[PDB]
Amino acid sequence: DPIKTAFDRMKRVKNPPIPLKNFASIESMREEINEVVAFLQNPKAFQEMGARAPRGVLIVGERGTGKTSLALAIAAEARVPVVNVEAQELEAGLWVGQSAANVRELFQTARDLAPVIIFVEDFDLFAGVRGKFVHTKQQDHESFINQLLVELDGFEKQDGVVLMATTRNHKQIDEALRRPGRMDRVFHLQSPTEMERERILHNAAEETMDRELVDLVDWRKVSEKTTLLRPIELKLVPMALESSAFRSKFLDTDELLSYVSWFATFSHIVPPWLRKTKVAKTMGKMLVNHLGLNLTKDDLENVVDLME
Amino acid sequence: AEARVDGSTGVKFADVAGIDEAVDELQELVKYLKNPDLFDKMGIKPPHGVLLEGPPGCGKTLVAKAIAGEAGVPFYQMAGSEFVEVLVGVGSARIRDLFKRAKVNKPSVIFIDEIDALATRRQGINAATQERETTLNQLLIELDGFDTGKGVIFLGATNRRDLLDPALLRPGRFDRKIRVRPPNAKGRLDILKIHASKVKMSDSVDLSSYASNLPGWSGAKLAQLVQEAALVAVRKTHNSILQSDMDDAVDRLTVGPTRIGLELGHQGQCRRATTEVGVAITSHLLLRYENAKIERCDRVSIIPRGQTLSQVVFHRLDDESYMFGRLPQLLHRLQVLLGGRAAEEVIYGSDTSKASVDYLSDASWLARKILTIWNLENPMVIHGEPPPWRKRPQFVGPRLDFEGSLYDDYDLVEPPVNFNMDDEVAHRSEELISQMYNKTVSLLRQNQTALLKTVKVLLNQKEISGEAIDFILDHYPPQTPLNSLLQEQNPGSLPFVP
Amino acid sequence: YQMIEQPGTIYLRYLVDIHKKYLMNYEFNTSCLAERRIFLAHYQTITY
Amino acid sequence: DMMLEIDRFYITLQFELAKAMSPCIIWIPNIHDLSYLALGLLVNS
């Protein structure tokens, strides 16, 4: 039973990786996200006011923009349980018509736990436009899309359950899914802004890389070098930047390996207060001075203007 | 096989519209269904089968359901795709079961939606195919063995006549063949009246213009028109369907939804604006001066919708003028086609772009069609040539369907033998295209003020109307200096209020 | 088969050597300044 | 419905054996032969 196995991966997300307050390219579309999370937190409030609650929101964007992190942050703000349903369990390609029963049991268990969210990634892979597949893959997909449409067309039954599907492009999705009342909201995320790039880069430097080394890097030009990039890559920039900074000098592999092995064996036993002792604080700096791994400003400026 | 036995199907002949010829032909079937006695006394052989062939969304299933409702007979509905299985022989058993259940309650109607699913032609271009052939054999045996005195009429709805086997088209199985044409202007009007009674409607909505300006649209497409109008009014929190929301649904389903802030550089929009405005200005000038038999500009836009970075909207004329396309009409439409390149050549001087290449290709092909296919000039030609490139007739861009279509030769092509007349045909086409290009550039260059003002106004407003273009043309007479436009406090300002 | 002749086999050798000494389960240190610098230099030397 | 169960048990036994032999090196030649069940196993692994 793939449905119960999928629902056995239930999670209560409280701490998102990138929260909505930190997430970028949402300020032009924040009111819709607020409406959706208000519906998710209190479905009774949307049911009593009589307006059509958003039954479906779709996120469109590029691979790696934090779209799964955006959904996680939406769930964390809404404080409702989520289930990660992969594309594989939907397309049980053994009997013609098992996908309809799969999603029927999915929605049935969702209704018994509502308000919940069905999170499906790579939605255009299985539920694209009709007619692109010629050999034998038309009837099962037709039954799947018809069952999905009639499940999303619940006649005034707002249980509080919502479906977030994830695709790459908005043209590959079928026109029948594009109508409101089945899939209400569309969220387009392409690229952040320069100030938001700077803010995410500085937060990444403040949570990953050395706090002593954050002022030595002019983050404006690093943001101008990471215009085509994404928030999770904006988070992973600083450690790669420090590695490329360390690339400039001349150093050997085996000395580093020996020091790494010694520290890995010896840091398992050393006490925390002995590490916070001033002796251990001044021991590391003399280790760096003797080994010669001082990271300077001009090194990192040459690194950032060396990149593309 | 849950064949729904409904005593009242819920729809009658008042629910169908635009299918007047077919329902008038099927009135004979209804008369046979309600009382067959006067049919039997004189000795008619009723049609064994009636095949409804037509485009999707035209309500052929609705037509059969209305026939059963008015006739007061049980309606047996089960689609052709329900006859396909993996096991062999089950489909023929279902055919036999449905047929005998029809013979239980005589008179009765058998309806098979998408009959071409089971009746695919053995094209000469798994065991499922054998199942299809066995189901076809069982169906033809049951149809041929049907005595006509018991009054069981079998209906077959199909979307494509070419893939259906000619054995069923033989008399004795499908005696009647009815085409379900897309509804006309009055038909779409009546469908709009029917579908507008279900949703709240305001008095400001004039459905006659929408019926006239949406040619060839099926009944299901009008249904989605009114449904998306309702959903747009819900989005705008409107208490009723306004004309603005209805037009919003029109532009949502015809050209597509508007994007948000997706614009190219200031040079990437000036060229498209210049091309579309030049095409519109040539069309309006040909309407104004020589009284051409061409279309009229509705609105011109450079806002990206769907996958068109800019668009100019042209009305569609009546089809009675779309049969005898004379030489002058084709020449003026061809001038309208090169209006874009005329605009690039007069505005930018000698640095044209790639935004007007498609119009150039269309002009080049219709010159060949004038020369070779139709043989409109009077040196006689021995052969016509098929189009190397084929672009389908489509939306707001230039009509290119004046003779049904542009890129469709009517099987008027032969392989050539002499290769010395091919170059004379090419030279004739080049002479025609070059002369016509000089005439269209000469006529458009005489009015640089109106063209430039229309470009500036459309660039400022991101959308202009045909009446605004007409106002610019009237307020800017020919041979006025460009400094008159250049001395204005705002060249992209429209003092006319619609 | 000198050093500079093949760089890829050296990288695979270093990867399997790090696998041998259980040097992968200890993914990071998050210490004050020194071990972090050593680890960054080591991660630089691993690939390039 | 018998092939899916046998294949799932087989692949989960392979993965459990690979875990039981830790530390170990798994080599998978000719990925291009890949079917949905093995894809699901690999993505969840």
mmCIF file with all atom_site columns, N, CA, C and O in Angstrom, chain A residues 182-201:
data_model
loop_
_atom_site.group_PDB
_atom_site.id
_atom_site.type_symbol
_atom_site.label_atom_id
_atom_site.label_alt_id
_atom_site.label_comp_id
_atom_site.label_asym_id
_atom_site.label_entity_id
_atom_site.label_seq_id
_atom_site.pdbx_PDB_ins_code
_atom_site.Cartn_x
_atom_site.Cartn_y
_atom_site.Cartn_z
_atom_site.occupancy
_atom_site.B_iso_or_equiv
_atom_site.pdbx_formal_charge
_atom_site.auth_seq_id
_atom_site.auth_comp_id
_atom_site.auth_asym_id
_atom_site.auth_atom_id
_atom_site.pdbx_PDB_model_num
ATOM 1  N N  . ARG A 1 182 ? -10.149 24.800 -9.107  1.00 0.00 ? 182 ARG A N  1
ATOM 2  C CA . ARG A 1 182 ? -9.368  23.581 -8.916  1.00 0.00 ? 182 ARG A CA 1
ATOM 3  C C  . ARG A 1 182 ? -7.955  23.878 -8.437  1.00 0.00 ? 182 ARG A C  1
ATOM 4  O O  . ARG A 1 182 ? -7.466  23.231 -7.504  1.00 0.00 ? 182 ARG A O  1
ATOM 5  N N  . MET A 1 183 ? -7.293  24.857 -9.061  1.00 0.00 ? 183 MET A N  1
ATOM 6  C CA . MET A 1 183 ? -5.920  25.261 -8.759  1.00 0.00 ? 183 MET A CA 1
ATOM 7  C C  . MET A 1 183 ? -5.979  26.794 -8.797  1.00 0.00 ? 183 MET A C  1
ATOM 8  O O  . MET A 1 183 ? -5.942  27.413 -9.865  1.00 0.00 ? 183 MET A O  1
ATOM 9  N N  . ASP A 1 184 ? -6.134  27.415 -7.624  1.00 0.00 ? 184 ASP A N  1
ATOM 10 C CA . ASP A 1 184 ? -6.532  28.821 -7.588  1.00 0.00 ? 184 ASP A CA 1
ATOM 11 C C  . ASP A 1 184 ? -5.353  29.757 -7.840  1.00 0.00 ? 184 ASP A C  1
ATOM 12 O O  . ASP A 1 184 ? -5.440  30.658 -8.683  1.00 0.00 ? 184 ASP A O  1
ATOM 13 N N  . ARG A 1 185 ? -4.246  29.569 -7.126  1.00 0.00 ? 185 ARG A N  1
ATOM 14 C CA . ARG A 1 185 ? -3.170  30.554 -7.135  1.00 0.00 ? 185 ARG A CA 1
ATOM 15 C C  . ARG A 1 185 ? -1.956  30.066 -7.916  1.00 0.00 ? 185 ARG A C  1
ATOM 16 O O  . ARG A 1 185 ? -1.660  28.870 -7.968  1.00 0.00 ? 185 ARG A O  1
ATOM 17 N N  . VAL A 1 186 ? -1.238  31.021 -8.507  1.00 0.00 ? 186 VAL A N  1
ATOM 18 C CA . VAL A 1 186 ? -0.007  30.759 -9.241  1.00 0.00 ? 186 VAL A CA 1
ATOM 19 C C  . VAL A 1 186 ? 1.100   31.635 -8.662  1.00 0.00 ? 186 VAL A C  1
ATOM 20 O O  . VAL A 1 186 ? 0.928   32.851 -8.515  1.00 0.00 ? 186 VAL A O  1
ATOM 21 N N  . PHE A 1 187 ? 2.223   31.012 -8.311  1.00 0.00 ? 187 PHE A N  1
ATOM 22 C CA . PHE A 1 187 ? 3.345   31.664 -7.649  1.00 0.00 ? 187 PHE A CA 1
ATOM 23 C C  . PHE A 1 187 ? 4.577   31.501 -8.527  1.00 0.00 ? 187 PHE A C  1
ATOM 24 O O  . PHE A 1 187 ? 5.137   30.404 -8.610  1.00 0.00 ? 187 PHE A O  1
ATOM 25 N N  . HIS A 1 188 ? 5.015   32.590 -9.153  1.00 0.00 ? 188 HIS A N  1
ATOM 26 C CA . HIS A 1 188 ? 6.156   32.565 -10.065 1.00 0.00 ? 188 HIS A CA 1
ATOM 27 C C  . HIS A 1 188 ? 7.384   33.074 -9.319  1.00 0.00 ? 188 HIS A C  1
ATOM 28 O O  . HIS A 1 188 ? 7.369   34.179 -8.765  1.00 0.00 ? 188 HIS A O  1
ATOM 29 N N  . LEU A 1 189 ? 8.447   32.268 -9.304  1.00 0.00 ? 189 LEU A N  1
ATOM 30 C CA . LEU A 1 189 ? 9.702   32.629 -8.650  1.00 0.00 ? 189 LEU A CA 1
ATOM 31 C C  . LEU A 1 189 ? 10.834  32.416 -9.645  1.00 0.00 ? 189 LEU A C  1
ATOM 32 O O  . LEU A 1 189 ? 11.171  31.274 -9.973  1.00 0.00 ? 189 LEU A O  1
ATOM 33 N N  . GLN A 1 190 ? 11.431  33.510 -10.116 1.00 0.00 ? 190 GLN A N  1
ATOM 34 C CA . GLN A 1 190 ? 12.479  33.446 -11.125 1.00 0.00 ? 190 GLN A CA 1
ATOM 35 C C  . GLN A 1 190 ? 13.847  33.805 -10.557 1.00 0.00 ? 190 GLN A C  1
ATOM 36 O O  . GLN A 1 190 ? 14.789  33.014 -10.666 1.00 0.00 ? 190 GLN A O  1
ATOM 37 N N  . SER A 1 191 ? 13.980  34.984 -9.944  1.00 0.00 ? 191 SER A N  1
ATOM 38 C CA . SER A 1 191 ? 15.267  35.438 -9.438  1.00 0.00 ? 191 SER A CA 1
ATOM 39 C C  . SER A 1 191 ? 15.032  36.497 -8.375  1.00 0.00 ? 191 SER A C  1
ATOM 40 O O  . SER A 1 191 ? 14.036  37.228 -8.465  1.00 0.00 ? 191 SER A O  1
ATOM 41 N N  . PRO A 1 192 ? 15.898  36.613 -7.377  1.00 0.00 ? 192 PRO A N  1
ATOM 42 C CA . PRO A 1 192 ? 15.743  37.656 -6.359  1.00 0.00 ? 192 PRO A CA 1
ATOM 43 C C  . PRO A 1 192 ? 16.216  39.008 -6.884  1.00 0.00 ? 192 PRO A C  1
ATOM 44 O O  . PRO A 1 192 ? 16.576  39.165 -8.050  1.00 0.00 ? 192 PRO A O  1
ATOM 45 N N  . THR A 1 193 ? 16.196  39.998 -5.997  1.00 0.00 ? 193 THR A N  1
ATOM 46 C CA . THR A 1 193 ? 16.664  41.340 -6.308  1.00 0.00 ? 193 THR A CA 1
ATOM 47 C C  . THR A 1 193 ? 18.039  41.576 -5.689  1.00 0.00 ? 193 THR A C  1
ATOM 48 O O  . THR A 1 193 ? 18.515  40.800 -4.857  1.00 0.00 ? 193 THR A O  1
ATOM 49 N N  . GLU A 1 194 ? 18.672  42.676 -6.111  1.00 0.00 ? 194 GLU A N  1
ATOM 50 C CA . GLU A 1 194 ? 20.039  42.973 -5.690  1.00 0.00 ? 194 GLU A CA 1
ATOM 51 C C  . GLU A 1 194 ? 20.133  43.181 -4.182  1.00 0.00 ? 194 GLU A C  1
ATOM 52 O O  . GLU A 1 194 ? 21.030  42.634 -3.527  1.00 0.00 ? 194 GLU A O  1
ATOM 53 N N  . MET A 1 195 ? 19.212  43.961 -3.612  1.00 0.00 ? 195 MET A N  1
ATOM 54 C CA . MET A 1 195 ? 19.203  44.171 -2.167  1.00 0.00 ? 195 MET A CA 1
ATOM 55 C C  . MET A 1 195 ? 18.890  42.875 -1.426  1.00 0.00 ? 195 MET A C  1
ATOM 56 O O  . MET A 1 195 ? 19.493  42.578 -0.387  1.00 0.00 ? 195 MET A O  1
ATOM 57 N N  . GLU A 1 196 ? 17.950  42.086 -1.951  1.00 0.00 ? 196 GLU A N  1
ATOM 58 C CA . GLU A 1 196 ? 17.634  40.807 -1.325  1.00 0.00 ? 196 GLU A CA 1
ATOM 59 C C  . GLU A 1 196 ? 18.777  39.810 -1.478  1.00 0.00 ? 196 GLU A C  1
ATOM 60 O O  . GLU A 1 196 ? 19.036  39.026 -0.557  1.00 0.00 ? 196 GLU A O  1
ATOM 61 N N  . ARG A 1 197 ? 19.472  39.833 -2.621  1.00 0.00 ? 197 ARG A N  1
ATOM 62 C CA . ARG A 1 197 ? 20.672  39.015 -2.782  1.00 0.00 ? 197 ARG A CA 1
ATOM 63 C C  . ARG A 1 197 ? 21.719  39.391 -1.745  1.00 0.00 ? 197 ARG A C  1
ATOM 64 O O  . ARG A 1 197 ? 22.348  38.521 -1.131  1.00 0.00 ? 197 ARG A O  1
ATOM 65 N N  . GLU A 1 198 ? 21.906  40.697 -1.531  1.00 0.00 ? 198 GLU A N  1
ATOM 66 C CA . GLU A 1 198 ? 22.856  41.175 -0.531  1.00 0.00 ? 198 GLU A CA 1
ATOM 67 C C  . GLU A 1 198 ? 22.459  40.723 0.869   1.00 0.00 ? 198 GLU A C  1
ATOM 68 O O  . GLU A 1 198 ? 23.311  40.295 1.656   1.00 0.00 ? 198 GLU A O  1
ATOM 69 N N  . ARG A 1 199 ? 21.166  40.805 1.191   1.00 0.00 ? 199 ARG A N  1
ATOM 70 C CA . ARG A 1 199 ? 20.694  40.416 2.518   1.00 0.00 ? 199 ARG A CA 1
ATOM 71 C C  . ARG A 1 199 ? 20.894  38.922 2.762   1.00 0.00 ? 199 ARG A C  1
ATOM 72 O O  . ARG A 1 199 ? 21.380  38.519 3.826   1.00 0.00 ? 199 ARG A O  1
ATOM 73 N N  . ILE A 1 200 ? 20.540  38.084 1.782   1.00 0.00 ? 200 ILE A N  1
ATOM 74 C CA . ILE A 1 200 ? 20.720  36.642 1.948   1.00 0.00 ? 200 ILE A CA 1
ATOM 75 C C  . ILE A 1 200 ? 22.201  36.283 2.010   1.00 0.00 ? 200 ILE A C  1
ATOM 76 O O  . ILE A 1 200 ? 22.603  35.409 2.788   1.00 0.00 ? 200 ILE A O  1
ATOM 77 N N  . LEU A 1 201 ? 23.037  36.963 1.218   1.00 0.00 ? 201 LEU A N  1
ATOM 78 C CA . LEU A 1 201 ? 24.474  36.708 1.254   1.00 0.00 ? 201 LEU A CA 1
ATOM 79 C C  . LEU A 1 201 ? 25.069  37.081 2.608   1.00 0.00 ? 201 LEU A C  1
ATOM 80 O O  . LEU A 1 201 ? 25.907  36.353 3.154   1.00 0.00 ? 201 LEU A O  1
#
